[PDB]
Structures are given as C-alpha cells and as structure tokens.
Tab-separated table of C-alpha atoms in Angstrom:
chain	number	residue	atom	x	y	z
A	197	UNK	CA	17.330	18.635	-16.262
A	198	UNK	CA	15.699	15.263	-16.752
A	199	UNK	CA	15.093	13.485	-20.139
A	200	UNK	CA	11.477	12.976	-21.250
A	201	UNK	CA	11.899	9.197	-21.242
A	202	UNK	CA	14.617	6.971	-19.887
A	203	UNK	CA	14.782	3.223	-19.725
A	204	UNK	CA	17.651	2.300	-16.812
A	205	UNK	CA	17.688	-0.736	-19.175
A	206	UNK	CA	19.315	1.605	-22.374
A	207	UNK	CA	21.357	3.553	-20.373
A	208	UNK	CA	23.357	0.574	-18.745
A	209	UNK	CA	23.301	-1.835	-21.312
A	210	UNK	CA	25.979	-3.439	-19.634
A	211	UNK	CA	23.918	-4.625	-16.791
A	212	UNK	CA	21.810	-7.925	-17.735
A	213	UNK	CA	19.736	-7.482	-14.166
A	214	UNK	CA	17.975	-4.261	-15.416
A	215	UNK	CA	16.207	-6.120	-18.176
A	216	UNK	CA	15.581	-9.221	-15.848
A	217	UNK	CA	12.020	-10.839	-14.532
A	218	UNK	CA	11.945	-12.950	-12.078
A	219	UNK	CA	9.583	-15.474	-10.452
A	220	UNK	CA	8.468	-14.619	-6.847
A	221	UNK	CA	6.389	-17.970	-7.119
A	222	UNK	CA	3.702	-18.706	-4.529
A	223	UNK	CA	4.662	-17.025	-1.882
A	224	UNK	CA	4.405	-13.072	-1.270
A	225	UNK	CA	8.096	-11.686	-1.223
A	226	UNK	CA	7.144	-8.849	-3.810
A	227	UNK	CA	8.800	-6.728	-0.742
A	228	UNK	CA	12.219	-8.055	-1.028
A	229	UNK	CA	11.773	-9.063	-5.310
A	230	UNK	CA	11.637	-5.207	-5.540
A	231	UNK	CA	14.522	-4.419	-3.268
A	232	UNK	CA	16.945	-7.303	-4.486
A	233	UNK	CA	16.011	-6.828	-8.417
A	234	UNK	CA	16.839	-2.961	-7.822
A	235	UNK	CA	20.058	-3.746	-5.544
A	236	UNK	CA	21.236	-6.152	-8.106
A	237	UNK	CA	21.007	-3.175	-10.579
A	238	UNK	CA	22.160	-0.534	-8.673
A	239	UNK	CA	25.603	-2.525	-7.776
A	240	UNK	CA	26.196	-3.245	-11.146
A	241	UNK	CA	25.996	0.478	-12.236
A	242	UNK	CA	27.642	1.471	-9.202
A	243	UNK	CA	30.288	-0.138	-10.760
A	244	UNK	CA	30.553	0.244	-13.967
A	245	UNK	CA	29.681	-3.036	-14.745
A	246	UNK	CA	32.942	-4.795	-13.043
A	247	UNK	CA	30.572	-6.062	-10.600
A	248	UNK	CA	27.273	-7.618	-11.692
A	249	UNK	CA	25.591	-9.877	-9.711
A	250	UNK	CA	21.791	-11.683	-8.959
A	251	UNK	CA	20.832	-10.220	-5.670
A	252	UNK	CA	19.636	-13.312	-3.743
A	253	UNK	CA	15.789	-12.713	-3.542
A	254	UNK	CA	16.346	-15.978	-0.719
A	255	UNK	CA	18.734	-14.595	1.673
A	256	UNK	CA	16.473	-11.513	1.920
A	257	UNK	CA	13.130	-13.102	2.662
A	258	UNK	CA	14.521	-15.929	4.704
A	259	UNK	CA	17.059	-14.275	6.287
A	260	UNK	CA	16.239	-10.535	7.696
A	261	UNK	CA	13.088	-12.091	9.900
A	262	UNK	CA	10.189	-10.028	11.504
A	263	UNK	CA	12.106	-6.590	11.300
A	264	UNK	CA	11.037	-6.762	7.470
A	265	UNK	CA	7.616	-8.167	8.469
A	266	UNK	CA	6.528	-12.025	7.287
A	267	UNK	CA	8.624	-13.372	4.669
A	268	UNK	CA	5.876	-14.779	2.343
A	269	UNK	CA	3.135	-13.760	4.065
A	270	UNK	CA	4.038	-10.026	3.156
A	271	UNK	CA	6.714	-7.488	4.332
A	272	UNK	CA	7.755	-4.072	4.850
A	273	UNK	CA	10.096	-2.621	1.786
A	274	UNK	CA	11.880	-0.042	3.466
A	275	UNK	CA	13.102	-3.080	6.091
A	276	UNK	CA	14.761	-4.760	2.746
A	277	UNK	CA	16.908	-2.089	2.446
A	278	UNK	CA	17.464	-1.557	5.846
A	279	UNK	CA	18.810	-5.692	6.177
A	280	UNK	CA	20.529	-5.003	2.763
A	281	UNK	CA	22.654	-1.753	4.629
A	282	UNK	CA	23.242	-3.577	8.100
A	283	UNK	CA	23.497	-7.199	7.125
A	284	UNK	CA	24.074	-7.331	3.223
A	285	UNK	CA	22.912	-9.968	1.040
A	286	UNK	CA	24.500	-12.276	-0.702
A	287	UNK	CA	23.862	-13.205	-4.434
A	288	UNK	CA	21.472	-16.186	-5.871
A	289	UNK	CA	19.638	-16.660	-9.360
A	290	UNK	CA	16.475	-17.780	-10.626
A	291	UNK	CA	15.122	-21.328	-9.183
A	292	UNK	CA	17.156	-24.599	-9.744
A	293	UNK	CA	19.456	-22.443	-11.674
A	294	UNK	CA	22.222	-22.979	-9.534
A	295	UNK	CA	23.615	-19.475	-9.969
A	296	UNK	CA	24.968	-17.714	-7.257
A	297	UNK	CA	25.613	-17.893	-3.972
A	298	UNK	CA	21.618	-18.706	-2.170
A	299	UNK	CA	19.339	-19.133	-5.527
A	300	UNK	CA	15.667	-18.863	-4.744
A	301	UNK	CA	14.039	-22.026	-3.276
A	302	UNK	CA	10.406	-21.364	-4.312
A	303	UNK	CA	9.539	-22.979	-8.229
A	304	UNK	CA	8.142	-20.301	-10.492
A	305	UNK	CA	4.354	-20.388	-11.332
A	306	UNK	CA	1.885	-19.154	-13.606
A	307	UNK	CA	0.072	-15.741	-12.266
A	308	UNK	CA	-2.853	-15.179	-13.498
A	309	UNK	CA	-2.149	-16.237	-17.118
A	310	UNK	CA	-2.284	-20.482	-18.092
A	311	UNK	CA	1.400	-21.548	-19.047
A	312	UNK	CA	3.606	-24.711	-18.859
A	313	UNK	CA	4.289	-24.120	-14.935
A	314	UNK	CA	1.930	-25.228	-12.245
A	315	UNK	CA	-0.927	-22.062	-11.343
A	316	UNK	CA	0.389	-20.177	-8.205
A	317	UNK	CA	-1.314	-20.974	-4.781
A	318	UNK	CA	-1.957	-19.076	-2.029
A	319	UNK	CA	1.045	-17.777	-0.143
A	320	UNK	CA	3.132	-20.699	1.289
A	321	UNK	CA	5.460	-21.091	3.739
A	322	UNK	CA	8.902	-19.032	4.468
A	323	UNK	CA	11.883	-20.968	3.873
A	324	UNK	CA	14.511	-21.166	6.783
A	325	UNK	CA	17.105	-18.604	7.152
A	326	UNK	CA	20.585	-20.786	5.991
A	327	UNK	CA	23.531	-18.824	5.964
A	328	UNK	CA	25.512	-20.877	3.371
A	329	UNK	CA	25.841	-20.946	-0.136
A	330	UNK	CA	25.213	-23.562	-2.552
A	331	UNK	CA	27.880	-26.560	-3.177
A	332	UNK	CA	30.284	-25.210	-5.527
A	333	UNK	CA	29.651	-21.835	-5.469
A	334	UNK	CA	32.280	-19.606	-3.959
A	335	UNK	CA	33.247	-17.438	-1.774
A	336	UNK	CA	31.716	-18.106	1.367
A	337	UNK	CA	28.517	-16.693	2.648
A	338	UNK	CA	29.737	-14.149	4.937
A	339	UNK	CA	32.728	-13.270	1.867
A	340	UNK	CA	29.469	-13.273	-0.434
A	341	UNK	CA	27.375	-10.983	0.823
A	342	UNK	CA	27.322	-7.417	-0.523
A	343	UNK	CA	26.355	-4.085	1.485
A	344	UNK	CA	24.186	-1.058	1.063
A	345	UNK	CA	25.619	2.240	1.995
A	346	UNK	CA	22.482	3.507	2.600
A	347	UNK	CA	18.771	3.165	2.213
A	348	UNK	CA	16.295	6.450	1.777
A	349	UNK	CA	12.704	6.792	0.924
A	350	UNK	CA	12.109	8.975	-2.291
A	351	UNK	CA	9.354	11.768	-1.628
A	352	UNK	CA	6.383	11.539	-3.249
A	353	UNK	CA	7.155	13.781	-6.140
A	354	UNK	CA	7.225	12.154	-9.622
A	355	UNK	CA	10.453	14.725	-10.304
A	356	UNK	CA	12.528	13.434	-7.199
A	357	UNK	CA	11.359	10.070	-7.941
A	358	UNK	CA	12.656	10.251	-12.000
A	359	UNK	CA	16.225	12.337	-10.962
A	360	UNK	CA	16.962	9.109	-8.393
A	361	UNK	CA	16.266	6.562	-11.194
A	362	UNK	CA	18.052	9.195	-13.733
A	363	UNK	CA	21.390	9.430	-10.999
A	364	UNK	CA	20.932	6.207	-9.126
A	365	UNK	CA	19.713	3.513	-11.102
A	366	UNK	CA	16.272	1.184	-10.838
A	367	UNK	CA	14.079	1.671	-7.257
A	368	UNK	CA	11.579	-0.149	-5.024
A	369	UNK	CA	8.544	1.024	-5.230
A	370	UNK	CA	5.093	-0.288	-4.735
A	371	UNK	CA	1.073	0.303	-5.159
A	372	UNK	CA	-2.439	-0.892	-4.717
A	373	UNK	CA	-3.182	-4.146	-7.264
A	374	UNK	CA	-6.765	-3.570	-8.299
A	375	UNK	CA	-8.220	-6.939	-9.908
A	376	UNK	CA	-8.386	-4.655	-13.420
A	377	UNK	CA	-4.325	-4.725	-13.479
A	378	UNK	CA	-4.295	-8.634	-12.975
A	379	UNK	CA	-4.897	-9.245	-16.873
A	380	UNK	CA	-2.394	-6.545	-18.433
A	381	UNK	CA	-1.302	-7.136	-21.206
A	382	UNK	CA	0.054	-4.078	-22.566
A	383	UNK	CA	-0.286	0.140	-22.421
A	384	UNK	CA	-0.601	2.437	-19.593
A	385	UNK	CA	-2.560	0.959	-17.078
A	386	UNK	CA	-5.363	3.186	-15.206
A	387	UNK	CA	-6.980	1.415	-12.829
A	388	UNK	CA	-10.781	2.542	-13.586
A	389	UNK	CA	-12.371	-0.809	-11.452
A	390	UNK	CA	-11.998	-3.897	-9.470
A	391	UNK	CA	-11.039	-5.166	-6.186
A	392	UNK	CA	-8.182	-4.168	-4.090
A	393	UNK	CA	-6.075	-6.989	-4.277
A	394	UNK	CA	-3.431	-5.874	-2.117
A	395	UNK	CA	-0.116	-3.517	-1.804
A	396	UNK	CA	2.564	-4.876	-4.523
A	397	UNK	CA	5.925	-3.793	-4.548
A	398	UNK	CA	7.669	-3.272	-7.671
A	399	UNK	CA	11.171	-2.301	-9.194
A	400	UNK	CA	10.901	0.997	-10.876
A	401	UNK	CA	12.977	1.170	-13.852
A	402	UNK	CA	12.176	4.725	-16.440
A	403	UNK	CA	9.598	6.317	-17.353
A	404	UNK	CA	7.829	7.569	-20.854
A	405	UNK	CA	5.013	8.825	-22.569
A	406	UNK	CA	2.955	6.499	-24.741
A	407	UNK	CA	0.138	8.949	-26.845
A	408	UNK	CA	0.041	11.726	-24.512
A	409	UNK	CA	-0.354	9.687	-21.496
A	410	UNK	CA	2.709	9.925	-19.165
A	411	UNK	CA	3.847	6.142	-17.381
A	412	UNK	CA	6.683	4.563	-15.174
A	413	UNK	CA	8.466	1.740	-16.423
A	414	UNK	CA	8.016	-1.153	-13.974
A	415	UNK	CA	9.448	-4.765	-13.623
A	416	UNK	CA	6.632	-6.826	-12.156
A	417	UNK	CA	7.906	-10.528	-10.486
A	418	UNK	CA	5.512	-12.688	-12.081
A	419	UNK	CA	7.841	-14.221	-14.284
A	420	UNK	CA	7.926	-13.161	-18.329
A	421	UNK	CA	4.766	-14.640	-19.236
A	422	UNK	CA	2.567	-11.969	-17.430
A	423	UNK	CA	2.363	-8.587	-18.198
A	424	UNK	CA	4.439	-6.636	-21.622
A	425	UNK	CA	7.603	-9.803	-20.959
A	426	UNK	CA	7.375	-9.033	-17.209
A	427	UNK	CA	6.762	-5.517	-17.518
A	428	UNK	CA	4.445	-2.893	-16.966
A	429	UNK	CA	3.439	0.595	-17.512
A	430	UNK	CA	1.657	2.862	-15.060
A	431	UNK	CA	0.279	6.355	-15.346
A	432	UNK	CA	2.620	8.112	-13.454
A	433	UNK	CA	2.383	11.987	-12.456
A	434	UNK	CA	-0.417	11.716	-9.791
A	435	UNK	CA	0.399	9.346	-7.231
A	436	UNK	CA	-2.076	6.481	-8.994
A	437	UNK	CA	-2.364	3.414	-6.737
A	438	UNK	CA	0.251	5.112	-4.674
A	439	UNK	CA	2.926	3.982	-6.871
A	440	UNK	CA	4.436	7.504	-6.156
A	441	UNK	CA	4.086	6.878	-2.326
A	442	UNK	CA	6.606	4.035	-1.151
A	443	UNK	CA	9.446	4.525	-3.525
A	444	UNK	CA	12.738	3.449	-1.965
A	445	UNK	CA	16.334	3.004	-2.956
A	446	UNK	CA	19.820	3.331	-0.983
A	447	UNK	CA	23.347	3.333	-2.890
A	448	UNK	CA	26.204	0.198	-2.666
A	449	UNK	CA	28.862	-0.115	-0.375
A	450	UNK	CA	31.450	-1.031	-3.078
C-alpha cells in the first residue's frame, strides 16, 4: 500500500541532502551526481539521521575510472553504485566549500538560464583520482569513505519504482533530455518536441499528481537557478523519456 504522493524530502525532514541541488558544472558527471546525491540520502535515513553526510560527487567521478565509463565525458550509473559497494566513497560538499572530506573541484555554472556564474562549456576535463582529503578535514580517506551494501536496478514498473523510494529512500534514475525540457520552469514536463540532447541521470525523490496528471519528483544537478529551485517534475506512469528504465539504488553498509 503506497501513498498517492510522497516527497522523501517530508518524510525525513531530518536529512538536509534530500532537499539539496547541486552543481555538476561543465563537465558531464550527471552519472555519479545521481548516485552520490541519492547515497548521501539513503545513509542518512539508513540511519536515522545519526549519520548525515555530502556524498563526494569528486571521489566518484575521479576515482572509480573506466569501469563507470568517462568521468566527464559521460558514464554508466549502475557502475556508481557498483564503486560505491566495492570501494565506497568518501564525503565532499559543494565547490570551494570546504566541506567534507574530497569537495567537488569543478566551479558551478549557469545551465541554460543567465545568472551571476560563468555559462557552462562543453564537457571538460576529468580531474585526477587523489585519494586524500582536504587539509583539516578528518578522518582519513580510507577512515572516510562509506560503503554500499548493495546496488540493484529497479524494474521498469512505476509501482516497484515508488515502494523502493517509499522503503528505501531517494534513487538514480535517468532519461532522454529533449531540447523542450532545457527551459523548465515549472509543471509536469511532457516532452511533445525538440532534439535529443542526450541520456541525463537524475535523483528520484517522490512522486505526485499535479491536476490529474501523475509526475516523479526529481532533483536535477544544474544548480538552484534552473528548473522549480533545482527540481523537476516528470509525467511518470509510462516509461516517458525512459525515466522508468534505468532506475537504480543499493542500501548502506552502516
């Protein structure tokens, strides 16, 4: 029995990551942005809130190398969650915020909106894999880093796909951008036209209804300036842009 509309953000208030954008900047690590936003939620909740910590988007693209495919040139999201299981990740914040143990290296940018950051450019470069942690910030790395469990795929069922968010916290998930989703603003978005931009992955984090139409609850990483704040809503219930198709997740090793 699942509710009719659940925002992972409500039902763990407790958890600041859930209700969290982040900045992938100019490079193309939506792959791991989806898996370490969700991780990062998932470990607080696993929990019970004694634990909450910013996933390190950094050790995750640098770090897991061509088994997750190439860093910011694109990459595999069931791979994230595979490095997060076998070689855990430590944790890291937002860019020049110092927080945690690897904080992102890449500078936010402005996507597809005009802001006070620099546009974004085309993809860059992958930072190096360093397996240390910032000056001052402690435990080690190797102490630092935190484990998955296990990693799964969801099935492409809109039910399964709502009872893991419902028991398990936010998912990975990810779909085709059309160039009609690059200006939302607000709503459900159909895609009715435009160019295929690209697979996007995503963190999944409820679902609703808005006027009859039914939608999933998603946390884009193109900072809080794009988008609803950050966020998104898709029409969910028939697989559109395959945001139904490469949903994954895993549970913490405490």
């Amino acid at each position: 029995k699942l509710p009719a509309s659940f925002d992972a953000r409500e039902q763990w208030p407790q958890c600041p990551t859930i209700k969290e954008i982040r900045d992938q900047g100019s490079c193309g690590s939506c792959w791991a942005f989806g898996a370490v936003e969700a991780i990062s939620d998932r470990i607080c909740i696993h929990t019970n809130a004694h634990v909450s910590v910013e996933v390190s988007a950094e050790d995750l693209l640098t770090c897991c190398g061509s088994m997750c495919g190439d860093g910011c040139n694109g990459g595999y999201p069931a791979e994230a969650w595979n490095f997060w299981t076998r070689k855990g990740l430590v944790s890291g914040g937002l860019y020049e915020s110092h927080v945690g143990c690897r904080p992102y290296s890449i500078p936010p940018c402005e996507h597809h909106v005009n802001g006070s950051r620099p546009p974004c450019t085309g993809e860059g470069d992958t930072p190096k894999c360093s397996k240390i942690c910032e000056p001052g910030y402690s435990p080690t790395y190797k102490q630092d880093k935190h484990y998955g469990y296990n990693s799964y795929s969801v099935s492409n069922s809109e039910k399964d796909i709502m009872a893991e968010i419902y028991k398990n916290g936010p998912v990975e998930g990810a779909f085709s951008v059309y160039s009609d989703f690059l200006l939302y603003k607000s709503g459900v978005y159909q895609h009715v036209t435009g160019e295929m931009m690209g697979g996007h992955a995503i963190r999944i984090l409820g679902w609703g209804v808005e006027n009859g139409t039914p939608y999933w609850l998603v946390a884009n990483s193109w900072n809080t300036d794009w988008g609803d704040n950050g966020f998104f809503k898709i029409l969910r219930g028939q697989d559109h842009c395959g945001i139904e198709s490469e949903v994954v997740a895993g549970i913490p090793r405490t």
